[PDB]
């Protein structure tokens, strides 16, 4: 889980909105709902801050060249698809497999398309430059050389990598295909996000039915 739905709730509008007498009576309670409004807007701006700290950690949007020469590693399932928003196949599947009383949901500062663009920038800079785009300037590197350095990072020599690169690329492609199969068949993968949004919706429905309570 990353972000919550930005539930911004006006204190008065929720409790007894559109009532001058009740607003005056609530004014006698000091700053209960004033401090409550400030705290809830603080939760909202803090959720936006979390979104920024988790997505907008880079200040440059990178794009891959038209030739998807990644050394045999298919990425269209993870690279954004321009034929439709600018989301990928897996991203579109995730968007597909997962779907008025003073409680206004403020739109995120970073909408769906902007989040797609952030993700595109991040993963594209990754696949194109290893870790240099995050360290300093984006120094492009061959993907085979990147895998070589990663293998040298866990204690194995890249000689076996370059001997078995065909089988390794085939294994990565078949793993992308299996992950397509999984994220398309078993939607229990996003069960965590589903339970988070369900808890949010349940809290909202409880807050609403409280107005029905006596």
């Amino acid at each position: 889980p990353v972000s919550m739905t930005k539930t911004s709730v006006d204190c008065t509008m929720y409790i007894c909105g559109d009532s001058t007498e009740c607003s005056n009576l609530l004014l006698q309670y000091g700053s209960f709902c004033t401090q409550l409004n400030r705290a809830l807007t603080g939760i909202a701006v803090e959720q936006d801050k979390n979104t920024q700290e988790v997505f907008a950690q880079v200040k440059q949007i990178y794009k891959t060249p038209p030739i998807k020469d990644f050394g045999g590693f298919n990425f269209s399932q993870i690279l954004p698809d321009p034929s439709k928003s600018k989301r990928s196949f897996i991203e579109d599947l995730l968007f597909n497999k997962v779907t008025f009383n003073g409680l206004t949901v403020l739109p995120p500062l970073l909408t769906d398309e902007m989040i797609a663009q952030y993700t595109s920038a991040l993963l594209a800079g990754t696949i194109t430059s290893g870790w240099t785009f995050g360290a300093g300037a984006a120094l492009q590197i061959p993907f085979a050389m990147q895998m070589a350095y990663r293998f040298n990072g866990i204690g194995v020599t890249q000689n076996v990598l370059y001997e078995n690169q065909k089988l390794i690329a085939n294994q990565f492609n078949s793993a992308i295909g299996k992950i397509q199969d999984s994220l398309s068949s078993t939607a229990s993968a996003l069960g965590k996000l589903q339970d988070v949004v369900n808890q949010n919706a349940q809290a909202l429905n409880t807050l609403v039915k409280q107005l029905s309570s006596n």
Partner: peptide, 20 residues
């Protein structure tokens, strides 16, 4: 297992990873 690299993907109010 020993980690190599990850790949993030856009998700509604969330994110997923492809941990190689």
């Amino acid at each position: 297992g020993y980690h190599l690299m990850s790949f993030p993907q856009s998700a509604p109010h969330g994110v997923v990873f492809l941990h190689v």
